[PDB]
């Protein structure tokens, strides 16, 4: 089986260096050019760079985003290609894929498609520190009532790292609950929301409390959400 195996992933501080080794097996490593591609969370593929095969000089070329910061090298005797990341910034955060450049011959020239892909390694660049969340009420009102049922929630804001869990009324209320995935704000902190649909008739008779648990900081927060009469 033809395989590519990356390693070196983890959380690293902005401005530091990290080396990603990629080990090849099941094919003549020296006969192929090797190429690195990355993918930021929830985003598309972005080419990082590539190193030519040994018979063509092992020269390298880099994408403009990483030129002057990242380098690439190969060791044919160990069947490894490296991505040496230097002077890392928050927007280098991505999954890093090691890929092989094909040799399939076309009409007078060879193609250069990326025909084998590793499973990737996750590199995270962040300077954030552990911090429990702030829980804010999403107060229901006429503006959040869509004919009989009203929506109400809690905004779990400014926490690090993931994850949090949200329950309602200590897990007694489950019907109508949707908890959303978190966003990552530019400050480096996460924020998510949990909203529940309840009947408007019971808004002033039944109490609604959201229970937020952020184990990485040993905080639990219960917040009572009160209806706004407007």
């Amino acid at each position: 089986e033809v395989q590519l195996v990356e390693s070196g992933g983890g959380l690293v501080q902005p401005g530091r260096s990290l080396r990603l080794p990629c080990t090849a097996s099941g094919f003549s490593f020296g006969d192929h050019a090797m190429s690195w591609v990355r993918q930021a969370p929830g985003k598309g593929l972005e080419w990082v760079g590539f190193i030519r095969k040994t018979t063509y000089g092992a020269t390298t070329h880099y994408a403009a985003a990483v030129r002057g910061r990242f380098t690439i090298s190969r060791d044919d005797s160990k069947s490894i290609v490296y991505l040496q990341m230097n002077s890392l910034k928050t927007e280098d955060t991505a999954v890093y894929f090691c890929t092989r450049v094909q040799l399939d011959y076309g009409p007078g020239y060879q193609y250069y498609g990326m025909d084998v892909w590793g499973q990737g390694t996750t590199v995270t660049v962040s300077s954030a520190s552990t911090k429990g969340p702030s829980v804010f009420p999403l107060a229901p009102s006429s503006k959040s009532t869509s004919g009989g049922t009203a929506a109400l929630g809690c905004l779990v804001k400014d926490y690090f790292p993931e994850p949090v869990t949200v329950s309602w009324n200590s897990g007694a209320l489950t019907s109508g609950v949707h908890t959303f995935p978190a966003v990552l704000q530019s400050s480096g902190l996460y924020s998510l929301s949990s909203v529940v649909t309840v009947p408007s008739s019971s808004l002033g008779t039944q109490t609604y409390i959201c229970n937020v648990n952020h184990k990485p900081s040993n905080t639990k927060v219960d917040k009572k959400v009160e209806p706004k009469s407007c």
């Binding site: 929830g42 498609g113 892909w117 804010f136 503006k143 869509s146 929630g153 905004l155 909203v195 706004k228």
Partner: protein, 217 residues
């Protein structure tokens, strides 16, 4: 990217035929550089789908085909199957960038349930948050299919793009989809404007929600 553009999402029923367009420029596809296509199944790594505009690797079924006309390329899936749900990416060399450029990607949905228009709820910054010198608007989208959507914000009618954070859809209890978007401001920015809007685009129709700082304080 900008040099290679794809529709964010396309959908079709099983057995039908859909196309994903890769719109290039004269510095890449128009110049005659070959087009490549990659398929990324959910939670998996990309795999080579089409190389050299039209050739298929050994383990790629013939329902996939690719062409290119001048400055654009196309990927055709003739006979959609449920396992074809994936992100699809096109790729070409670009002489301007001197590098390997990608399209932004296209989410293919293989329709397995009726399409659903989305529901939207816009919550204002809470009193509790404003007292902490913070302000966030929460826009929650729910009950839509296929699981693709576009969120845009406006302040006083004019678009606003700074401070926007949006998640990707996820399955709900009824196997539909939901997503969320945030607009972060200062308490002063909030109070200064007269209206804010969340616009949710889905299947060529847009649903818009509006909150007012003077109302429900």
């Amino acid at each position: 990217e900008s040099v290679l553009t794809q529709p964010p999402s396309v959908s079709g029923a099983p057995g039908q035929r859909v196309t994903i367009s890769c719109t290039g420029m004269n510095s890449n596809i128009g110049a005659g550089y070959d087009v490549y296509w990659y398929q990324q199944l959910p939670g998996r790594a990309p795999k080579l789908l089409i190389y050299g505009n039209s050739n298929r690797p050994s383990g790629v079924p013939d329902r996939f085909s690719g062409s290119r006309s001048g400055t654009s390329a196309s990927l055709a899936i003739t006979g959609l199957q449920a396992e074809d749900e994936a992100d699809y990416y096109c790729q070409s060399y670009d002489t301007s960038l001197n590098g390997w450029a990608f399209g932004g990607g296209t989410k293919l949905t293989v329709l397995g349930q009726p399409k659903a228009a989305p529901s939207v709820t816009l919550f204002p910054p809470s009193s509790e948050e404003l007292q902490a010198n913070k302000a966030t608007l929460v826009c929650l989208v729910s009950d839509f299919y296929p699981g693709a959507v576009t969120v845009a914000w406006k302040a006083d009618g004019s678009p606003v793009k700074v401070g926007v954070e949006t998640t990707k859809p996820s399955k709900q209890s009824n196997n539909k989809y939901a997503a969320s978007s945030y607009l972060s401001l200062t308490p002063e920015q909030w109070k200064s404007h007269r209206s804010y809007s969340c616009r949710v685009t889905h299947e060529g129709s847009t649903v818009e929600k509006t909150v007012a700082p003077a109302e429900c304080s």
